[PDB]
Each structure stands twice: as structure tokens, then as C-alpha cells.
Amino acid sequence: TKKATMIIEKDFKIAEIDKRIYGSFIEHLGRAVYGGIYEPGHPQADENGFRQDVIELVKELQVPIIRYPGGNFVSGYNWEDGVGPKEQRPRRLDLAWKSVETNEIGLNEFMDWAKMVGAEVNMAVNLGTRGIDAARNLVEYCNHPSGSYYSDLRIAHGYKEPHKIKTWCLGNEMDGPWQIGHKTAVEYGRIACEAAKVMKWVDPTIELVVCGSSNRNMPTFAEWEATVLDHTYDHVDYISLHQYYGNRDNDTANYLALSLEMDDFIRSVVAIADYVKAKKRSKKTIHLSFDEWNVWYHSNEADKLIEPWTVAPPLLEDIYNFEDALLVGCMLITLMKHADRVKIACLAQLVNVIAPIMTEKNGPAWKQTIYYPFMHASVYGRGVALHPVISSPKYDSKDFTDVPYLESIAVYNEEKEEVTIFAVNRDMEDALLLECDVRSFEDYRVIEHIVLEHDNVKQTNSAQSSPVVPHRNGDAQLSDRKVSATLPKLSWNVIRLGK
Numbered sequence: 001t002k003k004a005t006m007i008i009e010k011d012f013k014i015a016e017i018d019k020r021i022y023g024s025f026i027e028h029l030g031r032a033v034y035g036g037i038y039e040p041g042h043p044q045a046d047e048n049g050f051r052q053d054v055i056e057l058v059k060e061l062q063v064p065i066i067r068y069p070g071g072n073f074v075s076g077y078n079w080e081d082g083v084g085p086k087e088q089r090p091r092r093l094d095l096a097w098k099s100v101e102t103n104e105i106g107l108n109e110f111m112d113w114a115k116m117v118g119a120e121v122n123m124a125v126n127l128g129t130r131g132i133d134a135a136r137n138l139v140e141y142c143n144h145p146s147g148s149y150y151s152d153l154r155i156a157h158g159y160k161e162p163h164k165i166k167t168w169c170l171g172n173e174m175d176g177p178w179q180i181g182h183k184t185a186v187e188y189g190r191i192a193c194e195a196a197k198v199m200k201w202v203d204p205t206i207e208l209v210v211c212g213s214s215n216r217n218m219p220t221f222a223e224w225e226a227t228v229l230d231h232t233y234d235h236v237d238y239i240s241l242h243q244y245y246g247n248r249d250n251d252t253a254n255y256l257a258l259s260l261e262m263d264d265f266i267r268s269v270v271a272i273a274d275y276v277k278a279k280k281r282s283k284k285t286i287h288l289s290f291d292e293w294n295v296w297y298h299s300n301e302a303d304k305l306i307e308p309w310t311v312a313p314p315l316l317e318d319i320y321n322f323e324d325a326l327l328v329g330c331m332l333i334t335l336m337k338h339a340d341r342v343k344i345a346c347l348a349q350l351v352n353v354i355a356p357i358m359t360e361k362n363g364p365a366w367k368q369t370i371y372y373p374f375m376h377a378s379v380y381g382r383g384v385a386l387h388p389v390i391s392s393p394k395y396d397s398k399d400f401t402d403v404p405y406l407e408s409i410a411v412y413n414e415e416k417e418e419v420t421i422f423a424v425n426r427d428m429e430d431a432l433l434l435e436c437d438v439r440s441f442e443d444y445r446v447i448e449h450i451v452l453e454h455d456n457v458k459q460t461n462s463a464q465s466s467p468v469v470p471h472r473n474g475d476a477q478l479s480d481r482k483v484s485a486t487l488p489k490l491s492w493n494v495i496r497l498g499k
């Protein structure tokens with residue numbers, strides 16, 4: 001065993017958690033749409049061809065917001081190709097994923113799906129091959145009530161009431177050499193500025209997300225953000241961050257430390273936003289949208305075998321293991337501990353593609369290992385993130401020094417009279433004996449202690465069998481105004497307090 005302490009003080013707050021940090025992401029990629037949310041031949045398809053089993057799995061995650069339709073796809077996409085009668089929708093070469101896109105699903109059918117799962121849509125505009133005119137027309141088509149060509153066109157297409165989309169993305173991954181219509185930071189900042197202006201002139205109620213770096217390792221990291229915000233600050237509301245992690249070197253202790261890098265990435269982009277705020281003498285604070293995050297690496301060799309120009313290829317289908325779920329849990333706690341400045345985040349992606357939900361053709365939908373920590377964070381993690389004072393033992397790895405064994409934060413929900421403690425024990429050998437000072441919370445009790453643990457960090461789930469599932473047999477006890485809890489070696493823990 002090892003000992004760790006954590007102070008839970010009601011009056012030391014980070015911020016209200018914006019529920020949109022529990023967002024996700026659907027792109028026209030692989031089987032995310034075709035075979036994922038939408039499968040007209042499926043025995044459990046609804047009247048509109050949407051898989052009811054996937055709808056239930058999404059509703060249980062309580063995802064408030066879903067980014068759509070990309071992703072790398074968007075930068076070559078024409079939105080008019082996916083609206084109106086199906087017979088007039090063209091078949092296109094999607095250059096992002098070397099696939100044929102039929103456009104059988106486009107934005108109005110995605111809005112119908114989003115309504116069934118209770119999610120708002122974070123709509124992306126193409127700033128690769130397209131620009132300001134397309135951006136204003138899309139906003140008008142979606143948001144203007146009637147009495148103009150594009151608003152009456154949406155009505156003619158069957159959608160009388162406007163979609164009233166609140167939050168929009170100004171392009172996707174524009175810094176990447178892999179992007180269709182890549183732009184330098186100046187080129188991007190300029191077209192994002194001018195697109196943002198005409199979008200907000202159509203509908204001043206909207207909010208805009210400007211594109212940050214595609215990952216912390218970009219050669220343009222930080223320089224990009226500063227230039228793009230210099231060009232856009234007065235017209236935009238958020239800046240994005242993207243990051244995937246993987247365990248390519250089979251080093252569990254170094255892998256689980258990677259959330260420390262994610263923490264650095266967040267604090268760095270906040271600093272940039274506040275630099276440019278000061279440069280401009282602006283009163284407005286720009287916040288972060290962490291609108292692509294997950295584990296990704298398993299599918300790299302399978303992906304290389306897929307021939308180009310198929311419909312709905314089985315691309316980017318990682319099968320997650322137990323250690324992947326532990327890192328996802330560390331990433332979620334990292335988002336929560338930044339609730340003051342991270343207001344939107346998207347688990348990338350929701351179905352089949354780098355995803356917590358997987359499907360089989362004509363067959364079942366199932367929960368990956370990573371589904372459970374995401375569900376727990378979304379369902380139990382609404383309220384105020386408290387500022388922790390942690391005393392934890394530490395270890396050093398290949399890439400990181402003084403890595404706490406304990407990753408933890410507490411969320412206080414005043415309306416429910418609940419305090420929830422999320423905790424990962426990174427220790428590969430020892431139980432962590434955690435003592436939490438809750439003197440500041442009068443007359444509380446342990447409701448339950450949920451634990452996700454498995455002896456084999458490489459164990460996966462499948463359609464047939466889910467060996468990696470939570471139990472409710474955690475030993476957390478509240479006495480003498482202290483919560484004492486055993487966190488098993490290599491575990492995710494949700495300790496729920498109320499009364």
C-alpha cells in the first residue's frame with residue numbers, strides 16, 4: 001500500500017463545469033455515419049433508418065453537444081451536396097479518407113438524429129476549398145427563419161423551423177499539411193475573421209470556434225494560436241485543441257502519465273489567449289474547445305490494408321483495452337480541473353471511429369472499455385469543480401518526472417446536495433489508501449464507490465463478452481469528517497457522497 005491525501009474544501013472552487021466538456025463528435029468517416037448511426041437495413045432501424053440500439057447507448061452517455069460533419073472531411077465538403085432530394089445528391093470523392101461519399105446522409109438528417117439523442121450540434125464550415133460566401137449561406141440555410149432564398153430552401157427541403165445552431169467551427173485542422181486547403185496561420189486567420197463576421201451578421205446569437213493546433217507536437221504550435229487569435233479575437237469565442245494518445249512502446253507507467261502533457265497543452269493555450277487579450281486591450285476572455293480528444297493507435301496497421309474509393313470502409317476501428325480506459329479517465333479529470341477555461345470538449349469520435357460505441361452490420365452495438373469512465377464523468381460530473389490540494393507519492397518514466405500516482409478531482413452539485421470524487425490510481429503494484437478531508441461538507445455519507453479495474457491492462461471488450469465493466473464494491477467510508485478509500489492498483493474510481 002501507499003498513502004495519499006486530498007482536501008475537499010467547499011469554498012475553494014475552480015469553476016462551474018460547462019456540460020459541453022462532455023461532448024462528442026461524428027464525422028463522415030468510415031462507419032461512423034453509414035453502419036454507425038444510420039443503417040436502413042438493420043432490424044432495429046427506426047422509421048428514418050437510424051439504429052435504435054445506438055440511440056440508446058448515446059442517450060445513456062448524456063452527450064450534450066456533437067461536432068459534425070468533420071473533421072478532415074469538412075475541408076473538401078460542399079454542404080449543398082447533402083441537402084434536398086436524394087436523387088439530385090451527387091456521389092463525391094472524399095479526399096480526406098479516400099472514400100466515395102454518397103451524401104445519403106446530410107445535415108438535415110443529422111439534425112434529425114441529434115434530436116433523437118438529445119444533443120445540440122456544433123456545426124463545422126468548410127474553409128479549405130470554400131470561404132466566406134459558403135459560410136454565410138450555410139448559417140442562413142440553418143438559422144434564418146424564412147423569406148430569403150436559402151431559408152425558404154430549407155423549408156422546401158422539409159424543415160419548416162430553423163435548426164437554430166448555436167456553436168459553429170471555422171474550418172478543421174487548417175494548420176495540417178494533410179488538410180485539404182491547408183492555410184498558413186495568416187491565411188487562416190484572415191479567412192476565419194471574414195467568415196466569422198458574415199456568419200454573425202446572419203445570426204448574432206451564434207458563437208464561433210477558431211481552429212488551434214492539431215496536436216501539441218506541431219512545428220507551428222503556439223505561434224499558430226497567437227497569429228490566428230491576433231486576426232480573429234474580436235469576432236470569436238473559443239479556440240480549439242486536438243490530441244490523441246497511444247501506447248506504441250508498450251510502457252504502461254509512461255502511457256498513464258500522458259495526461260500531464262494534456263495539462264501543459266491546456267495551460268499553454270490559455271496563456272496565448274490571455275496574451276492576445278492583453279495585446280488587443282480586450283475585455284473579452286476567449287475559452288477553449290478541446291474538440292478532438294481520445295486514445296488512438298490500435299488501428300494503424302489495419303487502416304493500411306483498406307483499398308481507396310469504397311463506400312463506408314472500416315477505418316480507424318480501435319478496439320480499446322483496460323489501460324486505455326484509465327488514460328481516458330485521466331484525460332476527463334484533466335478537463336474537469338480546467339473547467340474555468342475549457343468550456344467544450346469532444347470525445348473523438350462517438351460511433352465506430354476511434355469510439356466508445358462499436359457496431360456490427362445487421363448485428364449488435366456494444367460498449368468499449370472507454371465507454372464507462374466517459375459515462376461516469378458525464379452522468380456524475382455536473383456542478384462545480386473544486387480546487388484540490390493533493391499529497392501523492394510520485395514516479396519518474398521515460399518522458400515524465402514526479403508523476404503523481406493519484407489523479408483526482410471533486411465536483412460539488414449544490415442542487416443535488418452531492419459531492420463526487422473521480423480518482424485514478426496509476427500505481428502498477430500498490431493500492432493507494434486515500435484520505436479526503438470533507439470537514440467543509442456538513443452531514444454527508446458515502447452513496448457508493450464505483451471501481452473499474454482488471455488484472456490484465458490489455459484486456460478488451462467485444463460484442464460477445466465484456467470482461468472490463470464497473471463494480472460497486474469500493475470500500476469508501478466517511479467517518480470523523482474524513483473519506484477513507486482504498487484505490488486498487490491500476491483503477492478508475494467514482495466515490496459519490498450525499499445527504
Ligand SMILES: *[C@H]1[C@H]([NH3+])[C@@H](CO)[C@H](O)[C@H]1O
Nearest residue numbers: 071072073172173292348
Ligand atoms: C482529427 C482526427 N485526427 C480525425 C479523426 O477523428 C479528424 O478527422 C481530425 O479533425
